[PDB]
Amino acid sequence: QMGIYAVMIEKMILRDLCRFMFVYLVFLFGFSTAVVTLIEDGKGNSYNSLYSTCLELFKFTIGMGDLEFTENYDFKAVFIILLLAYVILTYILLLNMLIALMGETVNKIAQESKNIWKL
Amino acid sequence: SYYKGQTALHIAIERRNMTLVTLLVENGADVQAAANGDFFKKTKGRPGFYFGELPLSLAACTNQLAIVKFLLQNSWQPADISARDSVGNTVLHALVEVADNTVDNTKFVTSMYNEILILGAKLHPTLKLEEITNRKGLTPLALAASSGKIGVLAYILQREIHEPECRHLSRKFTEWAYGPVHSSLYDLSCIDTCEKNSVLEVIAYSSSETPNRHDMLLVEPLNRLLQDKWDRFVKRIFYFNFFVYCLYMIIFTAAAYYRPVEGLPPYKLKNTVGDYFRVTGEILSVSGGVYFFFRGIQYFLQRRPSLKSLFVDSYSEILFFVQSLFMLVSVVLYFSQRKEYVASMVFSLAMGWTNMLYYTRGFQQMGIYAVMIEKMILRDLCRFMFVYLVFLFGFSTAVVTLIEDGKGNSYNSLYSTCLELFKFTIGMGDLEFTENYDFKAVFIILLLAYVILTYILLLNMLIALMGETVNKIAQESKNIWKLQRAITILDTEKSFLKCMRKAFRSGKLLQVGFTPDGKDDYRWCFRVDEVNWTTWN
Amino acid sequence: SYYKGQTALHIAIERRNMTLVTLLVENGADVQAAANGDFFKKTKGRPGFYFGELPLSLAACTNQLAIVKFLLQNSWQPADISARDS
Numbered sequence: 001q002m003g004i005y006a007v008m009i010e011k012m013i014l015r016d017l018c019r020f021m022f023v024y025l026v027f028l029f030g031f032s033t034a035v036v037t038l039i040e041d042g043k044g045n046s047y048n049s050l051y052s053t054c055l056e057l058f059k060f061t062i063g064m065g066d067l068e069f070t071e072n073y074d075f076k077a078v079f080i081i082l083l084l085a086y087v088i089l090t091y092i093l094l095l096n097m098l099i100a101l102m103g104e105t106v107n108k109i110a111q112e113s114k115n116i117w118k119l
Numbered sequence: 120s121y122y123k124g125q126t127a128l129h130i131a132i133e134r135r136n137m138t139l140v141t142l143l144v145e146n147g148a149d150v151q152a153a154a155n156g157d158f159f160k161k162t163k164g165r166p167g168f169y170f171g172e173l174p175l176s177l178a179a180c181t182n183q184l185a186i187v188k189f190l191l192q193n194s195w196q197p198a199d200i201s202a203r204d205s206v207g208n209t210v211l212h213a214l215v216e217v218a219d220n221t222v223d224n225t226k227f228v229t230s231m232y233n234e235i236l237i238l239g240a241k242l243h244p245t246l247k248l249e250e251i252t253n254r255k256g257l258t259p260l261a262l263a264a265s266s267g268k269i270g271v272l273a274y275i276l277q278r279e280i281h282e283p284e285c286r287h288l289s290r291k292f293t294e295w296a297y298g299p300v301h302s303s304l305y306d307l308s309c310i311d312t313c314e315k316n317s318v319l320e321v322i323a324y325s326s327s328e329t330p331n332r333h334d335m336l337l338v339e340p341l342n343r344l345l346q347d348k349w350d351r352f353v354k355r356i357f358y359f360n361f362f363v364y365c366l367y368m369i370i371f372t373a374a375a376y377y378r379p380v381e382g383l384p385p386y387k388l389k390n391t392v393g394d395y396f397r398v399t400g401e402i403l404s405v406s407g408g409v410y411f412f413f414r415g416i417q418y419f420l421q422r423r424p425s426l427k428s429l430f431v432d433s434y435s436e437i438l439f440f441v442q443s444l445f446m447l448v449s450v451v452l453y454f455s456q457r458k459e460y461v462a463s464m465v466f467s468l469a470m471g472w473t474n475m476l477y478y479t480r481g482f483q484q485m486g487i488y489a490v491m492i493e494k495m496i497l498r499d500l501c502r503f504m505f506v507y508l509v510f511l512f513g514f515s516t517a518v519v520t521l522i523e524d525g526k527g528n529s530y531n532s533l534y535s536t537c538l539e540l541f542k543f544t545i546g547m548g549d550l551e552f553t554e555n556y557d558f559k560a561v562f563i564i565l566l567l568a569y570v571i572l573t574y575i576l577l578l579n580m581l582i583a584l585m586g587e588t589v590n591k592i593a594q595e596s597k598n599i600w601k602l603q604r605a606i607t608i609l610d611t612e613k614s615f616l617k618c619m620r621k622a623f624r625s626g627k628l629l630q631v632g633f634t635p636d637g638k639d640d641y642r643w644c645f646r647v648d649e650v651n652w653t654t655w656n
Numbered sequence: 657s658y659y660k661g662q663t664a665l666h667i668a669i670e671r672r673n674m675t676l677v678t679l680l681v682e683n684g685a686d687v688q689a690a691a692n693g694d695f696f697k698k699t700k701g702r703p704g705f706y707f708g709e710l711p712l713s714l715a716a717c718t719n720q721l722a723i724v725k726f727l728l729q730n731s732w733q734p735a736d737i738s739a740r741d742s
């Protein structure tokens with residue numbers, strides 16, 4: 001029984017997590033680039049770094065996203081629109097995309113996991 | 120008047136009475152009678168069905184084999200088979216029109232189709248009855264292609280004949296068979312982009328109104344032709360566009376990230392190398408954006424996409440157009456002394472980086488993923504967003520009505536309440552974000568109702584719906600990806616019209632059989648080997 | 657050359673004509689003939705299928721029960737069953 005679980009973990013670390021990670025990396029990189037372009041820091045202040053922005057959006061996907069993590073921008077509307085677009089595209093859409101995809105996987109390949117454990 | 124186009128002949132056919140029709144035509148009744156009545160027009164919104172003005176068109180549309188046989192073999196006035204009806208359609212065009220996705224319909228409009236081809240060949244061996252075009256200008260292949268008669272299309276594309284004399288009008292030329300191993304050729308007369316409208320082009324550019332559009336491509340000669348070209352000469356070009364787009368987006372990202380912050384645009388041209396690199400990046404980005412804009416306009420004009428549903432068949436084109444628009448408006452505002460260009464630039468950057476997904480159609484697996492993302496951004500996400508917006512707006516209005524701020528103080532704003540409930544949606548909602556209220560019970564009950572209705576009820580409702588969607592439409596995402604690749608390859612091969620054409624051809628010129636005129640058949644075929652262990656004949 | 661490995665015997669088998677093959681081998685046609693042609697090689701990326709150089713290998717690869725029976729039971733030159741192909 002635990003063997004089938006390990007087989008599932010392997011199969012879906014080499015089947016689905018790779019693809020979803022590619023696409024999520026594209027989204028996060030694009031939106032992080034956009035946001036960091038928007039920030040100016042011309043006066044919680046060195047958000048500029050792209051790494052920091054990537055980290056904030058990642059916090060967004062793990063349920064610790066701060067929609068007002070920075071107030072140094074110059075168009076609050078643009079910043080909010082970008083963050084909301086990111087949340088809708090990743091948090092509510094892509095994560096649930098992944099959940100749906102993995103449901104499809106397991107539904108198909110329960111027996112496959114069994115046989116791979118036998119092997 | 121209505122009762123002038125018709126005659127006793129067509130009605131006698133309608134009853135399917137061979138004796139009645141032959142007796143009627145015995146005295147020498149005209150066979151060229153045309154039923155140019157609105158009741159017989161193709162309009163599907165009105166009663167009646169179009170079967171062709173010539174009565175033979177009616178009979179062929181019907182299963183009256185005897186009537187077509189006798190009319191074509193009658194000693195007097197054998198109605199010409201090659202006839203353009205009012206709409207320019209031939210009895211073959213009418214046949215394909217009458218064809219449906221129904222199996223029995225497929226059987227009828229396939230058997231009769233082949234039979235009539237043979238018969239017309241017999242009467243006129245040297246008549247290109249399968250080439251005549253209607254007013255719309257489509258051959259019967261082009262008709263089944265533009266309409267989507269998957270059965271008639273397949274019948275034409277795999278058409279084989281065993282009679283040596285009339286095998287010329289045949290689509291598939293079997294070559295040999297040494298054991299189950301047996302090659303299979305084809306014709307590719309207009310399959311390839313070598314005609315006014317190539318059935319591949321017709322399928323690719325046809326709107327989503329046509330049914331089974333993505334499903335027709337599965338016909339083996341077409342699908343194998345697609346895969347052959349893709350692996351032969353397009354995949355490399357597609358990867359080259361992917362790589363150049365990556366370089367474009369990286370240059371744009373680098374330029375934006377280093378956009379000057381001091382002073383309204385435009386700026387100046389320092390003597391340092393960094394300034395020069397920055398301007399090079401900016402100008403390269405501008406060039407890319409303007410190219411994308413022009414290409415979007417070109418697609419708009421050439422295709423003139425169905426305005427009713429343009430988001431379901433050109434999603435990527437709209438995305439690229441919008442990103443180009445944002446870049447262009449960044450350019451207009453930039454020179455127009457205003458630091459508001461950064462907004463357009465940022466939207467463009469996000470749009471392009473996210474659009475990188477468009478290239479994921481070249482890969483089997485990631486392509487299905489992108490197709491799913493598009494399908495559920497246009498299918499499930501919009502509906503859920505509407506309902507969630509209703510909930511959030513109502514509850515935000517309620518809460519803001521409740522707040523007073525009559526003394527974490529400027530929360531009266533409806534925007535703040537909407538943001539706070541949204542945080543509730545994304546798992547950062549503070550149940551006591553405000554204490555300027557005056558009824559704790561009311562405030563807490565409202566927040567709890569919102570949480571139950573959205574966070575635990577709706578969001579999970581969307582998860583359930585999306586599970587249903589994927590479970591249903593995995594295969595649909597696969598097929599849509601296939602169609603996306605088909606459009607990709609067609610566009611690529613069209614792109615090099617002036618670059619070159621000789622090497623961009625599929626199939627091989629061959630001469631297998633002979634035409635009744637005692638001449639050779641120079642046809643561009645394409646072999647297909649198959650292994651069948653049972654036929655054995 | 658390509659047309660040296662093959663013989664009338666293997667083709668006569670290919671048509672599945674028991675009468676033709678038995679007549680051909682009636683005069684004493686060789687049974688050890690080997691079809692060492694690239695067309696018969698095992699490569700799956702090229703046309704053709706490998707069925708074994710010995711014609712009996714072809715017939716067994718085919719469902720020709722009669723041919724295997726006769727050649728194994730023929731009065732003259734029953735092709736040896738134990739044969740290593742190329």
Ligand SMILES: CC(C)(C)c1ccc(/C=C\C(=O)Nc2ccc3c(c2)OCCO3)cc1
Nearest residue numbers: 085435438466469470473474476477489493
């Ligand atoms: C540029 C901003 C930040 C305003 C923005 C633009 C679009 C979205 C949402 C979606 C999006 O851009 N979705 C998409 C775009 C292109 C694709 C694709 C999906 O998948 C199929 C291949 O190409 C969000 C924010």
Ligand code: NA
Nearest residue numbers: 062063545546
């Ligand atoms: Na959470």
